[PDB]
Amino acid sequence: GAPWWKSAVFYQVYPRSFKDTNGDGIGDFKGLTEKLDYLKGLGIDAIWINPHYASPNTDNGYDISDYREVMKEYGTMEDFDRLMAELKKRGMRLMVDVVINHSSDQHEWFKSSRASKDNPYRDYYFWRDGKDGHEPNNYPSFFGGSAWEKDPVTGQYYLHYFGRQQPDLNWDTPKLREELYAMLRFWLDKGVSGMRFDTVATYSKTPGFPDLTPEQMKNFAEAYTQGPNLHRYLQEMHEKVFDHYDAVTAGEIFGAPLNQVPLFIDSRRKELDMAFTFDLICYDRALDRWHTIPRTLADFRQTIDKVDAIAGEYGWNTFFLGNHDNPRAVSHFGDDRPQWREASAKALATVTLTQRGTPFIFQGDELGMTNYPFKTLQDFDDIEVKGFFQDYVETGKATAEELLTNVALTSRDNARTPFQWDDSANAGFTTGKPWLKVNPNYTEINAAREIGDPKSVYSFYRNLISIRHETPALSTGSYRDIDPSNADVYAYTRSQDGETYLVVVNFKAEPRSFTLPDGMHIAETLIESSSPAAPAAGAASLELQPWQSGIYKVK
């Protein structure tokens, strides 16, 4: 049959904001472990946790100083091993982030590498002579300024596509690749069975490091994804590591042209199993990265369609509406106003759990958690906001009020407010002071209230997950968008083995009449949200309530 990961439902945990168990205001491993019964009851097959490794935390745990030790704030290695044992007892799996484009500059490999020109760690990184009293070339960093940083100790520059404190690892060095593979086995042998390769497209560097041409400088991110040994290295990794495990691998793919996505995920190529791309979640984001741009459902579905098409017959996509870097799903894609929050959250759940691909639910979206009501720029932890302030407010391009109004809608801090467990102090997230303020709407929106209520957003997610689990077409089935130009009602089929299901979701806060394709008829209604009655068997049309969603078997 199909690989386990194609029919699994994943849940993303950002452990810092999930559950604190020692009152320091920061979520931890023990907190996740104590909530596994909750996640199991929701119907979750596998949990992806954000970086859990030893890190100085200059970049949210993506600057790793020891790949074989855990992040101290989350707990100890034994806490981690206990988490794995409790997952295994429940038949659940763990996926981890793998950040091997670069390490922390505090990694012992880098401390050794930088110490002299002649040491066995020199080539674990990229060290080059400057040119003409300047850097080795004109490479810009994703985080601003030059991608080359001089080290007075040897007089050479080291490469960092990202932060200055994140030197790129040298995949051209076989010994380095072998270290990385050994490290991956360390985690897989502990029972980890999913690995998400962050910024996977930048692993391979261009031989000789020529200057970027003026055209390339205008999209340097794309140039950095075109290293000539990229797919060779991923194939080697697959052969040396993943051939020996049942684990799923996923690539965080960005910077590359859409048409290159299949190279990472086509099963025949033996590279990675599935793709994370950002076309949908960034579909309404302005170029400045803090404004939004008006879009419609037509744009939404067309974006879904082109990514689904790119996976084709042999590739596989993840699907998500939320993550740790983005505004809340219901606020972003639904309508978080009080009249529509629950209805639209349910509609987005139906979309999520009937998309072709492996769905990832972001912690708290199953409750219909919303964006946070920021009142001042001082309310943001978000390091990006500080940068926007410097680049746009201090330069006089925008006022602080304009920045606040808009980043409130787009900031990743919206996703990072603590998970709302109940209506006790700080929503039961912590007995102390939470590292980031809890949304005051926790008094209404919390797991304790929702789990006990058959009509809640939580209960609807759980019901959908059960339906998806028992309906093969809704995971591995084909997908067909009935009308990509329609900006009111999202309608599509999922089909497998002669069984065809129709999904219909009203994206308007108004009644809409929906006519099935001529010749198609409803056989059964599996589930609906915001509907007072299912259609009759034989129906050729639906009368949809505001934000109504449904899954139907068609004749």
Ligand SMILES: [Ca+2]
């Ligand atoms: Ca803690």
